[PDB]
């Protein structure tokens, strides 16, 4: 080998060896990730080096948590990572389609066919499939029912059915709460907080915020009914001079005077807060809650607690925006000009204690544009799994809202695209018809894997579904209970249009790029 | 005792003679053979494993060559010339290596035939001069005002890459970026795509969504949530100095002996921040971009005037913004003037892509800098697309600087080879044989194109040479796809004259340099 | 016993269960008591214990002798603990508690 | 993991689809090696032993025996090819090619969850039908000198180059016709093959006697 | 023909140290076996006749106890399925405080019966569905089995009788005395407001006199000694300070600038006079006990001794807050004298020695206050730790009783009744899930079987008698540990009772853990790393 | 993504110390080079000189 001739300690795989290595890696990934597809898939349990336990079903999480050191596996992992980052779904389908595309290409490549013709056929088939996907999508006004159906089709695949049913309501309600008219949805306005005391079905939606910290002074009220919210980012603790001043005195009395006078700067701001609290509410019915992004020294805590003010310190940076949107106040970086107009309102604030941790609830807001989901469960891995599931559901609902089109699921669109590609195949000149056929067969993997995971056999279920679609023309998928063809649109099995488009584009691009690779080199040492 | 005595230090190896020349030429040949199959529109791709753990799925010759480690110094020289060709013109990296390998291959025949290398070098230099003359002769002019011709040139430059599937979009992006970057101040023409044509790769989406913005895009967000994220016609002020209260350069110590001095010092810190912010506000801007931190009190004072602020920005991004919106970076806001205020940006929008916030200053009128937003399958695909876009932009700038074109697909190689062969018939000395040898060695480009196309090399090369022996056949090459001879006046494959000249010069001078070498000495430490 | 590809407890964990474990515990308690048997009564004898550094301790008190004995047997340490308890609460009888406990177990 | 590994910790086990993958990979590797041997246009391989002996060959059996392989399925295929060479004397490369292609085609359907038993049943039925068709298609002809020369050509032209095969055809046909007795089995032990190392490869010939 | 190579694909791509288990036999059966092994390991400690276990952790710290949660915590469990079951047991401990051994035993029995169900042919999904249905049926049935209510939480006798059963399993020899102690301690706490705090009960372990000498104190005990001359106060007027008992200093930088001889000669005298004035001002409020969380200055101590002020220093801020709650004072940030509302009062504060340990006692006389302390005697540190664990269990039982005042019969009667009812329900359920429902019902037998095995009698005879008595109608009849032969008796009359919340949460958590273990089909274990713990645990 | 595995098939089944050169560049050119080197070593002793 030439590369070995220059660098003796270099590993090279040339031409057919390179193709075999790539196809083997893709096939191994495909056989591992086959069982993830569908709600009837099998949970995978993942133990890290430190012994942490991870139960999950996501394709991306699984790929990240497998102990693999393969280049093609790394490329597919990057593709799935991009898929998850943008759309949040389809990673398992991504890996399955990439592997099946590579296998179908190899079927014809082993017969002496050059991969370039296969890639050209793949390009033509991808264009035709994209046209068909544009043709087949269903434009619907996204009411609550359709969003609930989409969230179910995601969560049921990602989590237990009953927990999925709870998470559907939670996710859809949160999304509808934070969404404004014709304005892009900011998912940062939904806080996903984890508590580890109750059961997994106790996860719910709070129309407000939950903070993982509470008041640091024991005398502060644990529960205030009607509260004014003061969201601020002003330090209330002692701060050094930037110029390294230090003090000089000649007697104990002078030292006492300097000690008393050195707190005046902080005391002025505490006095401003206290004066505003006195002005806004002169009775004990109303309450005052101070949430500060900066720390508060014990002296200011005592001064505030003497005035019946609940003060939370060291809040999260994003919590400033979340409180501003939910409570309705104004986040202040200084107290130079503070007015009652900048105060938010909360209909109930209380502190909940859980072991060593301490939590604060802010609910009963007027019209909260930012809400929080309280993930509850008995185990850490349960919380992680629920967090991944709710992330997937939020992404799916946001994608469905973004474009008013939704695509029927259960593999119906895959079968329809396969038949359309087969019909279009004669229109393709040259030997690219083989590539088009390979692309169609690769697209047919989703119903195959769904039927295989559901317990039925691939051939009979696939031919039944294909015959039904051909004779009727409807979009018929896979019934995971009976195995018979079924109209996914009528039963509520929906899939994101953007997810399908990204799947087609990314899978075709990565498969074409891998097919044309004829040499793997490691000569950087 | 009595350790051995000797003249040179230990581990000081030395080789000399015909063995050294044979080894050098073999190393050059093997380097050429490493990337021989990565030439032409039907070139296969390669997967380079970065020792850091990354993967480089690339077709560019220089990208492949610079990712490998070699021990033979001749291979090091080959890598260096590949890098030189890449930097000088932008493309042609995998052609100059092949040409140099072939020239050394045909020189080895004469070095084995009792011919001193100096005669071969003289013949090579004469051949290079005549190659340059012939290339300048068969060139054709191009009017840069024609958009279609420029797009065709860029396409012919990118048919051999992985971006040829989206060739129209890639050509439009490259041409727009190069034209937008073009600038001239104080009577000095300048096309600086390295600093002002920025390529930003964001994985995801589809490659058809990639475009070139009339502005600058950065991975930034507003410091405070209440600050505006959408402004129609912003007035931009750029700063490269902190808006905070920092210590002075000279050592300074305060001595507090009075009660009210500590609070007075803190109040003066606040007042200094307020005065700085008021100096900023006096120009009435809409957004403020700083390369250094902005204090929270400064944020509040700016927000009081309804001003958006981006906290920390790299120097290059700030320079790009200044070019795009016509601003001027200043350091002391008390000296801020109306001229430094950046007007010209037509929209500043801070939208969310995936799970990250990105700041757009697009919709500028007459911007001198741009960002090429690339969206694709993954990081490696985007990296390859960026490499292809770099090649396209380099070719576009080469054409803009030199509007001369020469036929591609080996037509220029065959024409120059035939011209050299015809000229050599007047030669009578011993120098003619290496002259003709390098003349026909220049034919390695069409041979490599035919080999990569899969067609039969011998009969196609014979027919092409016979065609080039005719009178008006200087533009006859080979199809990289169908493997058939075709006139390039009708195929449309043309490459810049500067690229071809640089490739030929680099190949010939590399051959000269490696032929001037004997008596390799190694082992001495620094 | 079977290899059990993934073992339940940490490798090297040592376990003992049943009547033999209790009998071994009783024997260890008897061994501990034997170290202070002779230090009881007017005709008692002193004990000399040398630490790692080399300092020697000559004592007749049962609690001191047991403390100087770096006992690591979990069941045997109970006698040392009760000797310390008797020394703390009362101050005399540190040998008697150990002798009585060992004799009960025997 | 596996029961055998539990009983024998230092044991190697391949179960379920793993065994099929291993066997099919071995068969496909052997087939890929031996593709370039079939036909007179097949490439010629040179094999170097440990001692440095050079052996140019194109036979399937010779290549299999002198090829550095330590795989079980390869061992089974080598044994089958050895028996094929021992009894019939020809058709060793075709044996490996057909076995590998059979396994690959079977995998093509097994990968869709099909049990291998169905594929084996189909294989047996197809074998019966193919044997019937082979009985139908064979050409029963009185073996004169021309037919024997044609068969010797069809073998040696694959084994060696043109002129050498032409010489060997006459040599072997004449030898067989010389030793053959009517209505008696041919005793191939009566053709002593002697090696001399002093002339060109085309100087080999048949001697109507003994050396 | 000598080695079996790795199959192409995932097997070859796996890392050097990783492990991949997939399928029924390779993963699910192994997980079930590990969980059953852990359950059997902890099994022998169940019930009043449970046997203590000596556990030596990695730091050679010795634990002897029959508490399942403590044993699991001190055991270096490595099988991740057993880790999940242990985490379920720990969650049960945190949520309720008792029933961890019940959780472990139920999970083990459920997984064993799940394994046999998988062996006979049932799929994993059917087993999971049947277990969930049976768990729902059990939760529906459970409220009907409530026999009696707490009906009073301010009575010493009734609370002691209620808590007696919870602390019979631990320290079976002497549970009446401990029940009385914990009842008194919990009744001093739990004021008119229904809220009850577990942390308001403090446990002090002073070695020397045997656990029969323990007592409950309506106050706080600190294992230290006074820093001043005064060692006893009869009308304590404690003034609690969080700042160090010294003249406060500037936080920026202190520098005594001296420019004349007069300032140098008068600085120390002025500082002394200021300290004396501050101490006298503090003492003039009537305060006679001063508690500080910081260091005590020598001059401040001298002037406190001059004015007869008792000094106690509490380094821990938790103890300072607990003392503030106990007395009723507010930790003053500065050294200013306390106004009358924020000055705590205690009926008696004195320095005393218990055994050989010097303690400071903040003693009340009324049977009230925010915090009550249980001083524990004993002859061994391990014995006092076990008694502390028993007290913790009793306190959690009282807290549960405050949360819900419903009880179920103990001694295995509830488990037998639940098993009978669930079996009857499953006998009327057509479909494949009847096997899973019946197995879930049978899994309840592990509790009375464990009780019988630990008590030394034949489990089968006990279970047969329990079925006979429950079938004839008696629902409150359970195992009788006070017999040499298999015998049963009514548990309601005998007073053995269990909290409804404990059984409810234990059943729910055990079922959830078993189902979660069953749901796992593939395991991918990374190469173990022998790191010195993650930084999160510190 | 730091090690190139051996291709499935004959590449993996090859013995530990064996070598396999196939194709034009790996076999024919190398053999021609070796023969050229041998001829080069013997060349200088040809003829009376
Ligand atoms: N209830 C259902 N019935 C039939 N098919 C379903 C049902 N739910 C989901 N599917 C199909 O199964 C697939 C689920 O794949 P999933 O596990 O979500 O992979 P990914 O997470 O990579 O998208 C979807 O493509 C959908 O078409
Ligand atoms: N469609 C085509 N048909 C024939 N030759 C082509 C075609 N496109 C490009 N070429 C030739 O291929 C060469 C470009 O190959 P490329 O991979 O870019 O190598 P380099 O990077 O060294 O230029 C040019 O010299 C051009 O003449
Ligand atoms: N006097 C008794 N007679 C019979 N059984 C009892 C008696 N006291 C308690 N039990 C039983 O012992 C069980 C308590 O076991 P225990 O060791 O406390 O485990 P856990 O701590 O996990 O609850 C209860 O279920 C109860 O039925
Ligand atoms: Mg999904
Ligand atoms: Mg190029
Ligand atoms: Mg004595
Ligand atoms: Mg043959
Ligand atoms: Mg208990």
JSON list of N, CA, C and O in Angstrom, two decimals, chain A residues 43 45 47 49 53 67-68 196 198 238 240 247 249 255-256 262 299 302 378, chain E residues 15 80 91 248 251-257 271 333-334 521-522 524 526 529:
[
{"chain": "A", "resi": 43, "resn": "UNK", "atom": "N", "xyz": [-37.36, -1.67, 25.68]},
{"chain": "A", "resi": 43, "resn": "UNK", "atom": "CA", "xyz": [-36.52, -0.73, 26.41]},
{"chain": "A", "resi": 43, "resn": "UNK", "atom": "C", "xyz": [-35.08, -1.23, 26.46]},
{"chain": "A", "resi": 43, "resn": "UNK", "atom": "O", "xyz": [-34.83, -2.42, 26.62]},
{"chain": "A", "resi": 45, "resn": "UNK", "atom": "N", "xyz": [-31.43, -0.76, 28.46]},
{"chain": "A", "resi": 45, "resn": "UNK", "atom": "CA", "xyz": [-30.90, -0.35, 29.75]},
{"chain": "A", "resi": 45, "resn": "UNK", "atom": "C", "xyz": [-29.40, -0.13, 29.63]},
{"chain": "A", "resi": 45, "resn": "UNK", "atom": "O", "xyz": [-28.67, -1.02, 29.17]},
{"chain": "A", "resi": 47, "resn": "UNK", "atom": "N", "xyz": [-25.74, 1.21, 31.28]},
{"chain": "A", "resi": 47, "resn": "UNK", "atom": "CA", "xyz": [-24.94, 1.43, 32.47]},
{"chain": "A", "resi": 47, "resn": "UNK", "atom": "C", "xyz": [-23.64, 2.11, 32.05]},
{"chain": "A", "resi": 47, "resn": "UNK", "atom": "O", "xyz": [-22.92, 1.60, 31.18]},
{"chain": "A", "resi": 49, "resn": "UNK", "atom": "N", "xyz": [-19.78, 4.04, 32.90]},
{"chain": "A", "resi": 49, "resn": "UNK", "atom": "CA", "xyz": [-18.58, 3.59, 33.59]},
{"chain": "A", "resi": 49, "resn": "UNK", "atom": "C", "xyz": [-18.67, 3.73, 35.10]},
{"chain": "A", "resi": 49, "resn": "UNK", "atom": "O", "xyz": [-18.14, 2.90, 35.84]},
{"chain": "A", "resi": 53, "resn": "UNK", "atom": "N", "xyz": [-27.42, 4.29, 35.90]},
{"chain": "A", "resi": 53, "resn": "UNK", "atom": "CA", "xyz": [-28.39, 3.49, 35.16]},
{"chain": "A", "resi": 53, "resn": "UNK", "atom": "C", "xyz": [-29.21, 4.41, 34.27]},
{"chain": "A", "resi": 53, "resn": "UNK", "atom": "O", "xyz": [-29.69, 5.46, 34.73]},
{"chain": "A", "resi": 67, "resn": "UNK", "atom": "N", "xyz": [-21.07, 1.71, 23.21]},
{"chain": "A", "resi": 67, "resn": "UNK", "atom": "CA", "xyz": [-19.61, 1.75, 23.27]},
{"chain": "A", "resi": 67, "resn": "UNK", "atom": "C", "xyz": [-19.07, 1.36, 21.90]},
{"chain": "A", "resi": 67, "resn": "UNK", "atom": "O", "xyz": [-18.66, 0.22, 21.65]},
{"chain": "A", "resi": 68, "resn": "UNK", "atom": "N", "xyz": [-19.07, 2.33, 20.99]},
{"chain": "A", "resi": 68, "resn": "UNK", "atom": "CA", "xyz": [-18.69, 2.11, 19.60]},
{"chain": "A", "resi": 68, "resn": "UNK", "atom": "C", "xyz": [-17.58, 3.09, 19.23]},
{"chain": "A", "resi": 68, "resn": "UNK", "atom": "O", "xyz": [-17.64, 4.27, 19.59]},
{"chain": "A", "resi": 196, "resn": "UNK", "atom": "N", "xyz": [-38.26, 14.26, 42.89]},
{"chain": "A", "resi": 196, "resn": "UNK", "atom": "CA", "xyz": [-38.05, 12.83, 43.03]},
{"chain": "A", "resi": 196, "resn": "UNK", "atom": "C", "xyz": [-38.75, 12.24, 44.25]},
{"chain": "A", "resi": 196, "resn": "UNK", "atom": "O", "xyz": [-38.13, 11.52, 45.03]},
{"chain": "A", "resi": 198, "resn": "UNK", "atom": "N", "xyz": [-42.80, 11.69, 44.29]},
{"chain": "A", "resi": 198, "resn": "UNK", "atom": "CA", "xyz": [-44.07, 11.05, 43.99]},
{"chain": "A", "resi": 198, "resn": "UNK", "atom": "C", "xyz": [-43.89, 10.01, 42.88]},
{"chain": "A", "resi": 198, "resn": "UNK", "atom": "O", "xyz": [-42.78, 9.67, 42.49]},
{"chain": "A", "resi": 238, "resn": "UNK", "atom": "N", "xyz": [-22.60, 42.66, 50.63]},
{"chain": "A", "resi": 238, "resn": "UNK", "atom": "CA", "xyz": [-21.44, 43.54, 50.67]},
{"chain": "A", "resi": 238, "resn": "UNK", "atom": "C", "xyz": [-20.53, 43.27, 49.48]},
{"chain": "A", "resi": 238, "resn": "UNK", "atom": "O", "xyz": [-20.26, 42.12, 49.13]},
{"chain": "A", "resi": 240, "resn": "UNK", "atom": "N", "xyz": [-16.82, 44.61, 47.46]},
{"chain": "A", "resi": 240, "resn": "UNK", "atom": "CA", "xyz": [-15.57, 45.33, 47.61]},
{"chain": "A", "resi": 240, "resn": "UNK", "atom": "C", "xyz": [-15.50, 46.51, 46.65]},
{"chain": "A", "resi": 240, "resn": "UNK", "atom": "O", "xyz": [-16.14, 46.52, 45.59]},
{"chain": "A", "resi": 247, "resn": "UNK", "atom": "N", "xyz": [-9.67, 50.46, 55.07]},
{"chain": "A", "resi": 247, "resn": "UNK", "atom": "CA", "xyz": [-10.05, 51.46, 56.05]},
{"chain": "A", "resi": 247, "resn": "UNK", "atom": "C", "xyz": [-8.87, 51.79, 56.97]},
{"chain": "A", "resi": 247, "resn": "UNK", "atom": "O", "xyz": [-7.97, 50.97, 57.17]},
{"chain": "A", "resi": 249, "resn": "UNK", "atom": "N", "xyz": [-8.24, 53.84, 60.86]},
{"chain": "A", "resi": 249, "resn": "UNK", "atom": "CA", "xyz": [-8.88, 54.42, 62.03]},
{"chain": "A", "resi": 249, "resn": "UNK", "atom": "C", "xyz": [-7.87, 54.47, 63.17]},
{"chain": "A", "resi": 249, "resn": "UNK", "atom": "O", "xyz": [-6.83, 53.82, 63.13]},
{"chain": "A", "resi": 255, "resn": "UNK", "atom": "N", "xyz": [-13.59, 52.71, 64.55]},
{"chain": "A", "resi": 255, "resn": "UNK", "atom": "CA", "xyz": [-13.81, 51.44, 63.88]},
{"chain": "A", "resi": 255, "resn": "UNK", "atom": "C", "xyz": [-15.28, 51.08, 63.85]},
{"chain": "A", "resi": 255, "resn": "UNK", "atom": "O", "xyz": [-15.80, 50.60, 62.83]},
{"chain": "A", "resi": 256, "resn": "UNK", "atom": "N", "xyz": [-15.99, 51.31, 64.96]},
{"chain": "A", "resi": 256, "resn": "UNK", "atom": "CA", "xyz": [-17.42, 51.05, 64.99]},
{"chain": "A", "resi": 256, "resn": "UNK", "atom": "C", "xyz": [-18.17, 51.94, 64.01]},
{"chain": "A", "resi": 256, "resn": "UNK", "atom": "O", "xyz": [-19.08, 51.49, 63.31]},
{"chain": "A", "resi": 262, "resn": "UNK", "atom": "N", "xyz": [-20.05, 51.45, 56.47]},
{"chain": "A", "resi": 262, "resn": "UNK", "atom": "CA", "xyz": [-19.70, 50.69, 55.28]},
{"chain": "A", "resi": 262, "resn": "UNK", "atom": "C", "xyz": [-20.86, 49.89, 54.70]},
{"chain": "A", "resi": 262, "resn": "UNK", "atom": "O", "xyz": [-20.75, 49.42, 53.57]},
{"chain": "A", "resi": 299, "resn": "UNK", "atom": "N", "xyz": [-27.50, 40.14, 56.56]},
{"chain": "A", "resi": 299, "resn": "UNK", "atom": "CA", "xyz": [-28.02, 41.38, 57.12]},
{"chain": "A", "resi": 299, "resn": "UNK", "atom": "C", "xyz": [-29.23, 41.87, 56.33]},
{"chain": "A", "resi": 299, "resn": "UNK", "atom": "O", "xyz": [-30.26, 42.25, 56.90]},
{"chain": "A", "resi": 302, "resn": "UNK", "atom": "N", "xyz": [-32.20, 39.63, 57.03]},
{"chain": "A", "resi": 302, "resn": "UNK", "atom": "CA", "xyz": [-32.85, 39.97, 58.29]},
{"chain": "A", "resi": 302, "resn": "UNK", "atom": "C", "xyz": [-33.69, 41.23, 58.13]},
{"chain": "A", "resi": 302, "resn": "UNK", "atom": "O", "xyz": [-34.84, 41.30, 58.61]},
{"chain": "A", "resi": 378, "resn": "UNK", "atom": "N", "xyz": [-40.14, 8.10, 41.08]},
{"chain": "A", "resi": 378, "resn": "UNK", "atom": "CA", "xyz": [-39.40, 7.52, 42.21]},
{"chain": "A", "resi": 378, "resn": "UNK", "atom": "C", "xyz": [-37.92, 7.30, 41.95]},
{"chain": "A", "resi": 378, "resn": "UNK", "atom": "O", "xyz": [-37.16, 7.15, 42.91]},
{"chain": "E", "resi": 15, "resn": "UNK", "atom": "N", "xyz": [-16.76, -1.97, 22.31]},
{"chain": "E", "resi": 15, "resn": "UNK", "atom": "CA", "xyz": [-15.50, -1.58, 22.93]},
{"chain": "E", "resi": 15, "resn": "UNK", "atom": "C", "xyz": [-14.88, -2.76, 23.67]},
{"chain": "E", "resi": 15, "resn": "UNK", "atom": "O", "xyz": [-15.49, -3.82, 23.84]},
{"chain": "E", "resi": 80, "resn": "UNK", "atom": "N", "xyz": [-26.95, -3.89, 38.35]},
{"chain": "E", "resi": 80, "resn": "UNK", "atom": "CA", "xyz": [-27.81, -2.70, 38.21]},
{"chain": "E", "resi": 80, "resn": "UNK", "atom": "C", "xyz": [-29.29, -2.96, 38.43]},
{"chain": "E", "resi": 80, "resn": "UNK", "atom": "O", "xyz": [-30.02, -2.05, 38.85]},
{"chain": "E", "resi": 91, "resn": "UNK", "atom": "N", "xyz": [-36.50, 4.74, 48.18]},
{"chain": "E", "resi": 91, "resn": "UNK", "atom": "CA", "xyz": [-37.61, 5.66, 47.97]},
{"chain": "E", "resi": 91, "resn": "UNK", "atom": "C", "xyz": [-38.74, 5.36, 48.95]},
{"chain": "E", "resi": 91, "resn": "UNK", "atom": "O", "xyz": [-39.38, 6.29, 49.46]},
{"chain": "E", "resi": 248, "resn": "UNK", "atom": "N", "xyz": [-17.21, 43.70, 66.46]},
{"chain": "E", "resi": 248, "resn": "UNK", "atom": "CA", "xyz": [-17.20, 43.48, 65.02]},
{"chain": "E", "resi": 248, "resn": "UNK", "atom": "C", "xyz": [-16.21, 44.41, 64.34]},
{"chain": "E", "resi": 248, "resn": "UNK", "atom": "O", "xyz": [-15.92, 45.51, 64.81]},
{"chain": "E", "resi": 251, "resn": "UNK", "atom": "N", "xyz": [-15.24, 44.77, 57.14]},
{"chain": "E", "resi": 251, "resn": "UNK", "atom": "CA", "xyz": [-15.07, 43.68, 56.19]},
{"chain": "E", "resi": 251, "resn": "UNK", "atom": "C", "xyz": [-14.07, 44.01, 55.09]},
{"chain": "E", "resi": 251, "resn": "UNK", "atom": "O", "xyz": [-13.63, 43.09, 54.39]},
{"chain": "E", "resi": 252, "resn": "UNK", "atom": "N", "xyz": [-13.70, 45.28, 54.92]},
{"chain": "E", "resi": 252, "resn": "UNK", "atom": "CA", "xyz": [-12.77, 45.63, 53.84]},
{"chain": "E", "resi": 252, "resn": "UNK", "atom": "C", "xyz": [-11.33, 45.39, 54.26]},
{"chain": "E", "resi": 252, "resn": "UNK", "atom": "O", "xyz": [-10.65, 44.51, 53.72]},
{"chain": "E", "resi": 253, "resn": "UNK", "atom": "N", "xyz": [-10.85, 46.15, 55.24]},
{"chain": "E", "resi": 253, "resn": "UNK", "atom": "CA", "xyz": [-9.50, 46.00, 55.77]},
{"chain": "E", "resi": 253, "resn": "UNK", "atom": "C", "xyz": [-9.32, 46.84, 57.02]},
{"chain": "E", "resi": 253, "resn": "UNK", "atom": "O", "xyz": [-9.64, 48.03, 57.02]},
{"chain": "E", "resi": 254, "resn": "UNK", "atom": "N", "xyz": [-8.81, 46.23, 58.09]},
{"chain": "E", "resi": 254, "resn": "UNK", "atom": "CA", "xyz": [-8.57, 46.94, 59.33]},
{"chain": "E", "resi": 254, "resn": "UNK", "atom": "C", "xyz": [-7.12, 47.35, 59.44]},
{"chain": "E", "resi": 254, "resn": "UNK", "atom": "O", "xyz": [-6.22, 46.52, 59.26]},
{"chain": "E", "resi": 255, "resn": "UNK", "atom": "N", "xyz": [-6.90, 48.63, 59.74]},
{"chain": "E", "resi": 255, "resn": "UNK", "atom": "CA", "xyz": [-5.54, 49.15, 59.91]},
{"chain": "E", "resi": 255, "resn": "UNK", "atom": "C", "xyz": [-5.60, 50.27, 60.92]},
{"chain": "E", "resi": 255, "resn": "UNK", "atom": "O", "xyz": [-6.12, 51.35, 60.63]},
{"chain": "E", "resi": 256, "resn": "UNK", "atom": "N", "xyz": [-5.05, 50.03, 62.11]},
{"chain": "E", "resi": 256, "resn": "UNK", "atom": "CA", "xyz": [-5.01, 51.05, 63.16]},
{"chain": "E", "resi": 256, "resn": "UNK", "atom": "C", "xyz": [-3.92, 52.05, 62.79]},
{"chain": "E", "resi": 256, "resn": "UNK", "atom": "O", "xyz": [-2.73, 51.75, 62.93]},
{"chain": "E", "resi": 257, "resn": "UNK", "atom": "N", "xyz": [-4.31, 53.23, 62.33]},
{"chain": "E", "resi": 257, "resn": "UNK", "atom": "CA", "xyz": [-3.37, 54.28, 61.97]},
{"chain": "E", "resi": 257, "resn": "UNK", "atom": "C", "xyz": [-3.08, 55.13, 63.20]},
{"chain": "E", "resi": 257, "resn": "UNK", "atom": "O", "xyz": [-3.98, 55.78, 63.74]},
{"chain": "E", "resi": 271, "resn": "UNK", "atom": "N", "xyz": [-10.64, 50.38, 73.44]},
{"chain": "E", "resi": 271, "resn": "UNK", "atom": "CA", "xyz": [-11.22, 49.12, 72.99]},
{"chain": "E", "resi": 271, "resn": "UNK", "atom": "C", "xyz": [-11.78, 48.33, 74.17]},
{"chain": "E", "resi": 271, "resn": "UNK", "atom": "O", "xyz": [-12.89, 47.77, 74.10]},
{"chain": "E", "resi": 333, "resn": "UNK", "atom": "N", "xyz": [-27.90, 39.30, 64.30]},
{"chain": "E", "resi": 333, "resn": "UNK", "atom": "CA", "xyz": [-26.70, 39.40, 63.46]},
{"chain": "E", "resi": 333, "resn": "UNK", "atom": "C", "xyz": [-25.58, 40.19, 64.09]},
{"chain": "E", "resi": 333, "resn": "UNK", "atom": "O", "xyz": [-24.40, 39.91, 63.82]},
{"chain": "E", "resi": 334, "resn": "UNK", "atom": "N", "xyz": [-25.89, 41.18, 64.92]},
{"chain": "E", "resi": 334, "resn": "UNK", "atom": "CA", "xyz": [-24.89, 42.01, 65.58]},
{"chain": "E", "resi": 334, "resn": "UNK", "atom": "C", "xyz": [-24.86, 41.71, 67.07]},
{"chain": "E", "resi": 334, "resn": "UNK", "atom": "O", "xyz": [-25.61, 40.86, 67.58]},
{"chain": "E", "resi": 521, "resn": "UNK", "atom": "N", "xyz": [-35.02, -5.24, 28.21]},
{"chain": "E", "resi": 521, "resn": "UNK", "atom": "CA", "xyz": [-34.74, -6.37, 27.34]},
{"chain": "E", "resi": 521, "resn": "UNK", "atom": "C", "xyz": [-33.29, -6.47, 26.91]},
{"chain": "E", "resi": 521, "resn": "UNK", "atom": "O", "xyz": [-32.81, -7.58, 26.67]},
{"chain": "E", "resi": 522, "resn": "UNK", "atom": "N", "xyz": [-32.58, -5.35, 26.82]},
{"chain": "E", "resi": 522, "resn": "UNK", "atom": "CA", "xyz": [-31.18, -5.35, 26.44]},
{"chain": "E", "resi": 522, "resn": "UNK", "atom": "C", "xyz": [-30.38, -4.51, 27.43]},
{"chain": "E", "resi": 522, "resn": "UNK", "atom": "O", "xyz": [-30.87, -3.51, 27.95]},
{"chain": "E", "resi": 524, "resn": "UNK", "atom": "N", "xyz": [-26.44, -2.77, 27.97]},
{"chain": "E", "resi": 524, "resn": "UNK", "atom": "CA", "xyz": [-25.15, -2.39, 27.41]},
{"chain": "E", "resi": 524, "resn": "UNK", "atom": "C", "xyz": [-24.36, -1.74, 28.53]},
{"chain": "E", "resi": 524, "resn": "UNK", "atom": "O", "xyz": [-24.56, -0.56, 28.84]},
{"chain": "E", "resi": 526, "resn": "UNK", "atom": "N", "xyz": [-21.00, -0.27, 30.07]},
{"chain": "E", "resi": 526, "resn": "UNK", "atom": "CA", "xyz": [-19.71, 0.28, 29.69]},
{"chain": "E", "resi": 526, "resn": "UNK", "atom": "C", "xyz": [-18.61, -0.33, 30.55]},
{"chain": "E", "resi": 526, "resn": "UNK", "atom": "O", "xyz": [-18.85, -0.95, 31.58]},
{"chain": "E", "resi": 529, "resn": "UNK", "atom": "N", "xyz": [-15.10, 1.93, 35.51]},
{"chain": "E", "resi": 529, "resn": "UNK", "atom": "CA", "xyz": [-14.04, 2.87, 35.83]},
{"chain": "E", "resi": 529, "resn": "UNK", "atom": "C", "xyz": [-13.91, 2.95, 37.35]},
{"chain": "E", "resi": 529, "resn": "UNK", "atom": "O", "xyz": [-14.89, 3.25, 38.04]}
]
